[PDB]
């Protein structure tokens with residue numbers, strides 16, 4: 284009866300696919316229809332809201348393709364008597380200050396970034412790399428808070444663990460995907476012939492994967508590369524390959540939680556003016572590798588591997 288939207292910036296990522304899946308679940312439970320829309324850019328975002336209004340949706344969950352669209356999104360929604368909840372990516376104002384007023388569901392970015400770093404360092408030690416000939420490549424998306432806090436967290440952890448600060452090289456990526464990250468990593472690789480072993484730091488699976496792909500192209504074998512993604516669900520195809528690669532593992536979050544919970548809260552809000560908490564931080568994480576990925580997915584009920 285009631286129709287609620289679930290707008291995602293990147294429909295191609297398993298992460299977002301899963302959030303859609305679990306929105307559908309909440310829909311069945313509570314008795315609402317979820318309208319699933321891809322919003323890969325600003326225009327499509329604004330158009331999509333119009334479209335929702337036409338369909339008579341009461342509200343929407345959104346992961347905006349651009350945090351800086353926040354103001355506009357709110358203005359449009361307001362106009363249509365729509366309630367908004369942000370998932371994953373927080374709205375910011377013109378100045379890049381967060382819009383605290385919009386309820387947000389997100390991962391504990393910093394904490395998860397830090398776990399990445401810890402796990403990078405641990406695996407390095409396991410392999411017995413000489414620090415003197417090792418480096419960290421940090422592929423950054425500093426314009427996105429959530430991404431920033433992951434990669435910063437990771438670098439902080441590595442530094443805390445005793446990885447030499449001066450051997451940490453950052454490079455911005457133009458896009459938060461494989462192609463973008465590849466390009467970025469490549470440009471950094473050719474700058475540093477002296478490095479024999481790389482740690483790859485990136486905010487998510489795709490970013491790290493791009494990094495890994497570049498290293499391979501520059502004649503690094505798996506043993507000499509450690510990349511640990513974040514998302515988990517996005518990494519399955521990699522972890523499924525016959526042969527081990529530079530991509531060691533991924534930190535599996537809870538896209539299920541993000542999808543279901545964001546939806547359920549909106550409904551309660553729309554249906555019963557039950558005001559959501561402003562901020563919901565999801566702290567779940569588990570390292571999945573070649574050995575355990577299958578169990579851990581099935582254990583979290585994201586079956587298939």
Ligand SMILES: C[C@H]1O[C@H](O)[C@H](O)[C@@H](O)[C@H]1O
Pocket residue numbers: 296298346371372390429459486487488513514
């Ligand atoms: C938790 C999410 O954070 C951002 O939205 C990234 O772009 C996603 O791929 C995902 O990792």
